[PDB]
């Protein structure tokens, strides 16, 4: 399984916990998850949960863990200047 060597939340390296969701490459500082110790056993990272509701996410910010279910995707993501990678409202689409 491939994972990034930098935290998806803050962008820096260090002690990172890795997502167990199939094919998810995301890794995170515990601090950046608002956790004080690694989750025990199989763990799915915050990218798989909708920002707006309790449903699983299906549409993803490519620059941070924000993501959205089918009911919340419209208008929550826009194609960025970086190869059309989708970004949430927290990034300048011209320089994500």
């Amino acid at each position: 399984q491939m994972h990034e060597d930098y935290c998806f939340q803050c962008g820096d390296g260090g002690e990172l916990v890795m997502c167990d969701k199939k094919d998810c490459p995301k890794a995170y500082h515990l601090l950046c998850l608002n956790l004080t110790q690694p989750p025990y056993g199989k763990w799915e990272c915050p990218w798989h949960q909708c920002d707006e509701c309790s449903s699983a996410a299906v549409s993803f910010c490519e620059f941070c863990p924000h993501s959205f279910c089918k009911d919340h995707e419209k208008g929550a993501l826009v194609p960025s200047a970086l190869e059309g990678r989708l970004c949430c409202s927290e990034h300048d689409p011209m320089a994500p």
């Binding site: 930098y6 390296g13 260090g14 002690e15 916990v17 167990d20 690694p38 989750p39 199989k42």
Partner: peptide, 9 residues
């Protein structure tokens, strides 16, 4: 969950 230690920018 598994952890690793990488270089910190």
């Amino acid at each position: 969950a598994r952890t690793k230690q990488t270089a910190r920018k």
